[PDB]
């Protein structure tokens, strides 16, 4: 009889920035993992962006399973990042630390974040994303507190009172929502529930995409 | 088949202000539990907060006990707003809105033509120039008007300009939800201090005194809106000179002494009563007979 | 069709003053059951009350006995007024005004041609310099006078001071009621309990010499126009000289002694009967011939 949080349920795929933590790579390939990445493929095709901390290329490889090819960016490829942030590069995925496929492209040292902080053109697009869009985060074992994320959004955008962003996490206690919620609402984001096992993350999120896209399209 | 009270039947659309009460928005639908009463409604706000995993087990059952009392459940909804909305007021939290959105949607899909005819009849008097105000949180009139006949705007008592134009009969865009309307939850004032702030201004109080003297008000479905707090504080306090020109109410006949008790009691408050004693599907048919009579005398 | 008793044509129109009965206001919609015979007025207020919730079915069955236990019927109407209008301090009470308008509404809808001839004739008789008095609450003779282009002044004795002008004959086209007036049912006084309290101004009763010997009455349609004692009380307390009372009544032929007796009583009182072959629409033409003969000899 389960339901999906309605304000996030109103959202239409162009509206969204999908930020992917390690927990989705952990949920993934298993047959339920291929059904998750099938859901990701539909979202990004319908005009969301996908971004990830993760160095893997599971998304680009799953695009080969269902008749597509998807392009990987790293934060040294500032030209393609500008075209991605301007919505022009459809089928382009960002890996924030970079992707294992490009060794010089990987950014980890503070100077890699500072290269984006120096790029006022891409930083203006980063502010613009956070002003315009609603963001959905997944599997936040690092992403919200990530030193790249903290440099890239958190130095750059101060509308932290005025956000309309959502997260998923699998709720085990009152304190787990609260404790998350306090730092999350200081960043500006709101918490949401699923709550039985990691198997709900594929199943819930596939029906969330179905309702988002069937309303939006 | 039934008569119209002739001093009411001969009134015109410019003269009137209508009130719709909670029973109507339920009665339109043969199959909506969640609006049948204030107890059905507060049951569904906890159903949303429970099923979305937004209220904890202890808090849910603690409020459920308080709601079992039947002791002013309308005021227990004030206590639920005090729990739900964070008072670090610069933070525009969504959660209260997300509760309400679960229940106050998928309404129209169930409905029947006799209910739609009631909404069209109400809209015809509003269009022809009546001002409408209502008890309810819902939007059924604004959805039904936006769909097939008018621009309809939903208003709460917080907005000084929009209430001033409503009092001046200018803002014929609007339907006035005295308490507050579910697609604007930040606006909701169940707690007295907000409508008491509308009492404070001397020129606004001239417009309010003028409003109660000038027109005839009709109430529908059940009229208990006379004593649902906000209505009493602004309108009823102003009886400095008890002119009380005719205002009118419908009721369903019951067993006869209940109707008698109401009739006597409200006629001393200032307000006249009329009966029907039939299947509720005839209540929309009766309201068509009254609607034609008023509107054809106006236009 | 047997013509004018030659007493009639002699009288110059400003000498006459008239009173209108039952069958006249019936003939201005004569298939409506509520006027066919005067018990029908209460039959219709009861048949309204069964649906319109003035009284229970058991109070209704008590009045059904009162319909079979007839005579006293005009003070049965006074007792029914005392049932339907005890009062608070002032205001506009729900049971009464807003129930009479089941029977004194929706007459004007049926002002047929044969009926309008009588009211037409009376109206020009008013313009020809008479004064007029009317039994009923009803306003037919006010409305079909504004149709021909004159807006009548209604009089009833609760408008206390205006008799100062009416006995001076100054308020031309003013019509003075008896069983009150439909535009202000508050004015009703069916009984010695009411009307004569105004006539405590005994200069009016003195000038009623000038209004009962120096001038001539004519009475339409009935016999009911005097045979319940109202047309003893408001007039015989001033004067009783049967030699020079100088007044008339229109009637119908029937079985011989049952026609004769009313002529015998009336002629002994000092009022003169006029009689023809019975049928309803002939009275309209009888009255117009009489009016043409009077108004031409008054020209």
Curated annotation (Swiss-Prot), chains B, C:
Transmembrane segments: none annotated. GO terms for cellular component: Cajal body. It comes from the Eukaryota. The keyword Membrane does not apply. Keywords: Acetylation, Nucleus, Phosphoprotein. Pfam families: SIR2_2 (PF13289). One of its GO terms (molecular function) is identical protein binding. May play a role in Cajal bodies formation. Belongs to the FAM118 family. Overexpression changes the morphology of Cajal bodies, while depletion disrupts the localization of components of Cajal bodies, reduces splicing capacity and inhibits cell proliferation. This is Protein FAM118B. The gene is FAM118B.
């Amino acid at each position: 009889p389960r339901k999906l949080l309605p304000s996030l349920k109103t959202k239409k795929p162009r509206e969204l920035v999908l930020v992917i933590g390690t927990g989705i790579s952990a949920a993934v390939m298993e047959d339920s993992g291929k059904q998750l990445l099938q859901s990701v493929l539909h979202l990004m095709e319908n005009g969301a962006l996908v971004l990830t901390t993760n160095f893997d290329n599971l998304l680009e490889l799953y695009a080969a399973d269902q008749g597509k090819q998807l392009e990987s960016l790293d934060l040294t490829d500032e030209k393609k990042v500008l075209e991605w942030a301007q919505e022009k590069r459809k089928l382009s995925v960002l890996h924030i630390h970079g992707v294992y496929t490009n060794p010089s492209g990987i950014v980890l040292h503070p100077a890699g974040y500072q290269n984006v902080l120096r790029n006022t053109e891409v930083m203006r697009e980063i502010q613009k994303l956070y002003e315009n869009k609603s963001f959905l985060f997944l599997g936040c074992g690092w992403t919200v507190d990530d030193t790249t994320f903290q440099a890239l959004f958190l130095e750059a955008v101060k509308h932290k009172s005025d956000l309309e962003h959502f997260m998923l996490v699998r709720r085990g206690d009152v304190d787990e929502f609260k404790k998350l919620r306090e730092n999350m609402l200081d960043k500006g984001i709101k918490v949401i529930s699923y709550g039985d096992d990691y198997a709900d993350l594929p199943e819930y999120f596939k029906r969330l995409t179905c309702e988002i896209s069937t309303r939006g399209t």
